Design a protein around this ligand. Structure first.
Ligand SMILES: [Zn+2]
Ligand SMILES: [Zn+2]
Ligand SMILES: [Zn+2]
Ligand SMILES: [Zn+2]
Lengths: 183, 182, 183, 182
């Protein structure tokens, strides 16, 4: 029975079981465009609630990745239709950090947004009533935010990692600080 | 650049790339509990829309599976919280085929509901505005609904396939009539 | 502070406070196209959860009405765009009861669907984990399903009324039975 | 046949028809907690789309209100359940204007957040695909964001108005810059 929840992108350029060094059925999996945890998405949140409360999964992983079309279409003007609405949550993140990204060479922005987005989604995840509740009642649970680089097939931990609400705040804020200030 | 969209279940052992002879790269994947296509689900409908309108994917496959925790949780009268609201859609489906399902041995009922489900999710998929308009404007698009078993593999009753709204009805209705023959 | 939740149509052809013989602020109000309670609509369900669990509202009213455009567009072919997706829940209800409605004169079908829909939405409402939970813990709560006739300005109770899950089943099933079998 | 769409809050005393000189009949109304237009909310976006594309409504008004239970529940650290997830969107907004709000006397903070909110919901409304395409294709459409008070009535700082994506930026940004002047 599964011990992990993988929240990944529908691009699914990796096999989650390879990257996690797991076999299938250990992994409970949700996937959407640009691996989002939206506060009021019933679909993702159901997944999380069932995993956390019913299955007692101890580890949730948001894995983002490079050369993601959601990330690219988020940065692009183009009216693509309904998917724009879903990607507007990422555009909001794009402008939230517009100073960092402006300072950036246009060609390194997608890589950077991919990262920022993973951090932000782990932050959304750790603020859900589900996860906070699990923590308050002593349930063991850890959130993780990874990025797969499609161009060299490597994972990178993004230093975003929470086992409580205080630890969420500490590593989120520190992650954004590095991303914002470091070269 | 991907050529297929796979709608699967969050439980299912066996990811799309293992079940298929397709790499990761050619598969665009959505997964949720009990592999649903709910009419008003922004999450899944955004995957479908992006797949069809933008990536120009020409085949969508809804894959259900036997021994599925969603299907089983749908059937139980358990207060599991938020997830029950998601699964109420599967319980509507159960109630809609209650007569058929009531006829079966209780041990055969989960396998039936799993197959009925794929059939209903392909019927929902195929009535979305996104898919009808694709067809309306002449874009090639095939919907498929399959059920996977760990032991037997893919059940050679297959089921649903649609290349239009008209083939959608025929295929849906026959699949239900066929599953009713016991 | 409010003692009722009104779930009504965005057509809002009535003033809810007139119909309920209430003043504003007694009424907590949600409105959408064709007064739906969809199982996985986060928007409506939030409204209900906040009303039931935080505000301790004792009465939820789903009020439907005649000459509703949601009901009409549900019955119509026409691809209107995104609203079709929302109205597909009503089309499903339209075909669920296609034998009743077929037996009907084409001009009385909209009136009938309006009614069926109110009954079905009270049924969805009473199956939500929120409302069922409220009941299991002894909370006092009653669901009601009304229809306003715009052409003569009258309410009609639809005999759909639940104060538990057993009473939900009894009046729902009886409501459909009358609608199905009676002239 | 309606001519206006009103997006209001489920709390607010005073329905649209009382606040306005419009009958019921001319108003199409959506109400949710803290009068939100969330990018991915099928419920509200279906009202907007039907209003704009089908009913051809030419004015949308988001009306917020002072002494609003959503705004207040957003600010509290209370575990109220599902509703907190809905309100996390308001808390993002709080965090986004934290510096401004941190400057104010705590007793003035709820009124500010209420006004900031309407400004952000009009900004979301105006970036939906439905509204941009309406404008793109030349259809006349005006977005308005007002805040109501039980005592003072409508606050004559008004705020946002958009008849295009360009007027949307100007109006949004100025409204925020203006509310920052203390
Ligand atoms: Zn991706
Ligand atoms: Zn499953
Ligand atoms: Zn109506
Ligand atoms: Zn309010």
């Amino acid at each position: 029975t599964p011990h992990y929840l993988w929240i990944g992108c529908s691009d699914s350029r990796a096999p989650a079981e390879k990257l996690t060094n797991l076999e299938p059925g250990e992994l409970f999996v949700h996937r959407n465009v640009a691996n989002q945890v939206i506060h009021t998405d019933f679909n993702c949140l159901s997944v999380v609630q069932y995993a956390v409360d019913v299955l007692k999964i101890e580890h949730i992983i948001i894995c983002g990745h490079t050369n993601c079309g959601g990330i690219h279409a988020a940065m692009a003007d183009k009216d693509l239709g309904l998917i724009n609405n879903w990607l507007l949550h990422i555009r909001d993140i794009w402008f939230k950090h517009g100073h960092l990204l402006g300072k950036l060479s246009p060609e390194k922005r997608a890589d950077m947004l991919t990262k920022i987005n993973v951090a932000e989604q782990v932050y959304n995840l750790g603020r859900t009533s589900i996860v906070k509740s699990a923590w308050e009642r002593g349930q063991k649970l850890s959130l993780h935010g990874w990025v797969y680089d499609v161009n060299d097939g490597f994972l990178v931990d993004q230093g975003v990692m929470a086992t409580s609400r205080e630890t969420l705040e500490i590593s989120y804020r520190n992650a954004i600080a590095r991303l914002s200030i470091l070269d």
